[PDB]
Amino acid sequence: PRYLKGALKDVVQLSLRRPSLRASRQRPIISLRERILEFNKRNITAIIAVYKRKSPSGLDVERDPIEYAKFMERYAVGLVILTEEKYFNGSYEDLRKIASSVSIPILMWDFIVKESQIDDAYNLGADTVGLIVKILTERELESLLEYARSYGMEPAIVINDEEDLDIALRIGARIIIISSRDLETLEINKENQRKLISMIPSNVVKVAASGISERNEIEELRKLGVNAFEIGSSLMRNPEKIKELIL
Ligand SMILES: Clc1cc(Cl)c2[nH]nnc2c1
Numbered sequence: 001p002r003y004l005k006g007a008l009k010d011v012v013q014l015s016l017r018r019p020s021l022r023a024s025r026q027r028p029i030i031s032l033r034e035r036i037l038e039f040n041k042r043n044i045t046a047i048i049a050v051y052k053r054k055s056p057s058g059l060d061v062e063r064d065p066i067e068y069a070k071f072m073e074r075y076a077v078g079l080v081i082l083t084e085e086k087y088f089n090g091s092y093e094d095l096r097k098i099a100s101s102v103s104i105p106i107l108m109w110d111f112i113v114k115e116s117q118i119d120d121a122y123n124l125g126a127d128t129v130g131l132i133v134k135i136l137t138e139r140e141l142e143s144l145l146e147y148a149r150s151y152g153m154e155p156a157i158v159i160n161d162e163e164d165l166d167i168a169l170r171i172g173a174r175i176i177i178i179s180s181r182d183l184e185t186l187e188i189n190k191e192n193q194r195k196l197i198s199m200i201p202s203n204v205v206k207v208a209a210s211g212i213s214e215r216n217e218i219e220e221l222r223k224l225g226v227n228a229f230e231i232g233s234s235l236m237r238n239p240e241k242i243k244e245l246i247l
Contacts (some may be wrong), residue, residue, distance in 0.1 A: 001113055001135050007008040007056070007087065008183060011111050012135055013085055020116035021092060030127050033175045033205050034039060036228045041079050045218060045246040046077035048111070048207065049053045049239075050232030051098070051101045053082070054089035057186055058233040068239060069098040077228055078105035081126070084108075093125055099125025111135060118148050128153045133164040134183055141171050156207065162241045165196055176200060177230060181210035197224055215245055216221035 001012045032048075049072045054060045065081075072079055081098055082090030090110070099106055108115060110189035113135065121129045131144055141157075146157045157173040159165045160182050164219035168176055178200075180193040188211045199207050208221050209230035218229050234241055 001005075001140070002137060004135060007186065009186070011064060011084065011087060011115055015084075015111040015113045015117065018110075018114075018117060020087060020127060021120055025123055026127055027099060027104070027127075028126045028190050030103070031154065032107055032128050033154050034186060035077055035173075036207075038091050039100055039228055045222075046228035046246055047242055048078045048080055048107070048228055048230040049076040049083060049235045049242060050080040050230060051094065052088050052090065052109075052232055052236060053142070054087065055082075055233065056087060057181060058236075060089065061233075063236065066097055068236075069102045071239050072235075072242065073102045073104050075165075075246060077119050078106060078107060079232065080107045080109045080130075080232075083108055083110045083120075083159075085149045092120060095121075095124045095126060099242050101105075113140070116195045118144065118151070119154075122151045122153070126153075129155050130177060131155045131160045132158045132183075133167050134158075135162065138167055138170065139166065144169055145173075158209075159196065161192070161209070165199060169201070172204075173204060175205040175207065177207040177209050179209040181228075185196070196226060197221075197226060200225075215247065 036046050081095050082088040082093050084090050105127045108121040108129045151198050155173045156177045158177045159168050160179050160211040178193050179194045180190050205227050207228045208226045212231050
């Protein structure tokens with residue numbers, strides 16, 4: 001991993017020790033990237049709902065993962081499921097249960113630093129994973145990206161600054177998540193997010209993440225070329241808000 005400090009250093013060290021599991025995937029890879037493009041073709045708003053019990057940027061929400069996923073199956077373009085345990089109170093059990101239950105694309109959100117986490121995602125039924133430029137070297141990003149591709153996954157590459165974006169383009173990213181939330185400071189900077197969006201080539205699918213709460217925001221971002229919209233805490237507290245946001 002890169003040179004880190006504080007909680008990011010901690011989460012990375014914990015991820016390195018994350019026990020791997022054994023399971024048989026019994027699910028095709030269903031592409032998140034492709035379904036986003038299809039939603040764009042059909043002029044229907046593509047919202048990726050996040051399932052997360054805890055986060056550094058919210059109060060804890062205890063709710064049933066299956067009930068959540070099955071509700072979102074009707075409305076969301078895909079789901080992101082937290083499997084990081086210490087800071088997000090996720091588990092691979094949430095992923096297994098959700099993947100067995102729904103037929104929409106699933107992205108596993110964790111702090112991926114070793115190949116066995118990708119094995120875990122695959123074996124549990126996730127369609128793809130995020131890779132986080134903030135915590136990985138160029139070399140690690142290229143190796144993990146190729147490894148995920150060997151399972152037929154196309155990882156989303158997660159960025160929040162220019163240096164991160166340049167590395168995402170260097171590795172041949174095809175789908176990028178531009179998060180407005182800095183992982184270290186928890187600052188939301190939407191000016192910076194828009195600037196990053198403007199710099200992504202047109203053939204890369206662009207997902208805007210964090211700070212999205214209104215249909216008017218989604219409309220403005222779509223006009224700037226954003227393809228889909230990742231939304232977490234507000235849906236965790238009020239899942240049916242998604243019906244307003246897609247209207
Ligand atoms: Cl997989 C993943 C990872 C991080 Cl850090 C994210 N931040 N916002 N959306 C995300 C998805």
